[model samples]
Target: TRKPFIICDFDGTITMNDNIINIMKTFAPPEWMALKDGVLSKTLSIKEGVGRMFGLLPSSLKEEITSFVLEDAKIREGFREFVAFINEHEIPFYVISGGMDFFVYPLLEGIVEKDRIYCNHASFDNDYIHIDWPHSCKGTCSNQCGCCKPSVIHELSEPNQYIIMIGDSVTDVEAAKLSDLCFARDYLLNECREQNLNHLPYQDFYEIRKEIENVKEVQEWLQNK
Candidate 1:
């Protein structure tokens, strides 16, 4: 139980851009903006909001959108190196993302093991894109968080492990709160500062590598190992 593990967000944290936001901006109609505002205003829950945002796109764009995102997205700097470090250390790393599985799976096909990844699923049988929640929110979590990062951590975590959440947006809000430490950027950094959570602002995976190995608790755990 006294081992270190890592849980990370994929959209902006791993890939330099949030694929869902980009997908909506590129393919979905302008009407989706209101849905974005509704999410920001808390008038709509993420489950309904993100689900509807995706529903704006027609099912026919599946191949087009898939190709576009695959070519357009840029992975964050030093991510491969960071993953290598984690693999060498044998750290239990998980990609618990709010992004859909369609593109998420394809993007991380080689970088991370399939079993270690978790995200919401997508279906295109309907006229518009339909989302499926495979990793649904578990006990005591009433929030309709879509993929629900906190739920994944709860299921995968042990009390003595040095749990870490690396993310860049509000979708990671709950998971960051539950993490023993957080590597944050963009909006997630803002939230961490606001909440005074245990966090470190990072620009890329290199800094994440620097912090993790040097962190006092992690070093102590290393010695224990």
Candidate 2:
């Protein structure tokens, strides 16, 4: 049987903080803050809030904004080692991000292969920045997840593999509900608790790696029993 495949979030879970939030702080108007708060508190759909936040910025600033993000982004401690561990165990991993590809792809460039990363796309042709959703919700899902992690999971999931979701915010909520196991932090931890999903707590990739190992052992024990 195949080991569970990990679906990791980008913003706070992999990067030490959220680059989009940082970009807003530096370049966008103060109103962007409320959209962020609303998104995190689950008071607004990601489709609306994420759009409004980026729309607040002028599209002409793409070069400056992206440079700032690249210069300032901080990846979680021990993430490289964690990826190595996953590779050693032959586990499948995917970076299913709520972030737009312009910045997300660059931030994750050397670490995760481009083929395995799924994220929202952005078009700068508008006066204000616009996000494009090639992975929006379909069928029974009406959550309007923006990047639509649940849809990506549905499209990419294998019948033979258990799926694990690892993330840190409301953007991850719907996808967490769809996964077999969820490792959560920040607002996502709160959401998982409220929703009653099968979950675990973790701060860094090292903790996630250890948690995965324990779960593998439990799976083996249950297999023998």
Candidate 3:
């Protein structure tokens, strides 16, 4: 049996839209978005940006924002089919993200198991959003990732396994570097182009599925490597 690993990003890549920033910007203050943009543009670190952004949020907005994200967020087209395909083929699939667990889980609609979904987490207490991140990764890392996608890739991956990462943000660039193969879009696509990383640009899962099927040599290559 061949072991094929697929790691997908949750925000814009899988979801119909980027609900993480959307939830914060729409429900929280404008400063949060400003800080987010600054962080993405390299003006601020992820830890600092998230800290400042969360500080700006009002407790009253938690329910409204959480509800908005759950009710309005739609999964990307063909995602369910892709999940089914992977399951049928016995390929391991994981959803890795920098987004919060509260939103990512509801958006996935039970397609991904809770254990396989990794990222930051938020809790609601007295209408406030409190961070209760996983303790596995230290927050002081340069990427300031909540769970460190690349770290997960390194720890969970077997020596002979082909690591395939799918993502759409700059944070995913680090994971792309660690991955044997990458599917990039949006921000990560540009990063891959800049860094000359091995990647495939995909607009949707159908395209990705087709490409994977065409690349028959990948399995043989994984076996040999």
What is the TM-score of each predicted model, taking all chains together?
A: 0.96, 0.89, 0.88
Q: Tell me the alpha-carbon RMSD of every candidate.
A: 1.3, 2.8, 3.0
Q: Rank the candidates by lDDT, best first.
A: 1, 2, 3
lDDT, candidate 1, at 180: 86
Report lDDT per candidate: 0.88, 0.84, 0.76
Better of 1 and 3 by TM-score: 1
Q: Tell me the tens digit of each residue's lDDT in model 1 across 86-171.
A: 89888989998878888888888888998899989889999999999888789878788888777888888877888888989875
lDDT of 2: 0.84
Instruction: Compute the lDDT for candidate 3.
Output: 0.76
Q: What is the lDDT of residue 147 in candidate 2?
A: 77
- Indicate which candidate wins on lDDT: 1
For candidate 3, write residues 74-103 as lDDT tens digits.
Answer: 777788888887877677788887778778
In model 3, the Cα lDDT at residue 157 comes to: 76
Candidate 1, residue 166: CA error in Å?
A: 0.5
Candidate 2: segments with Cα more than 4 A from true spot: 37-43, 217-225
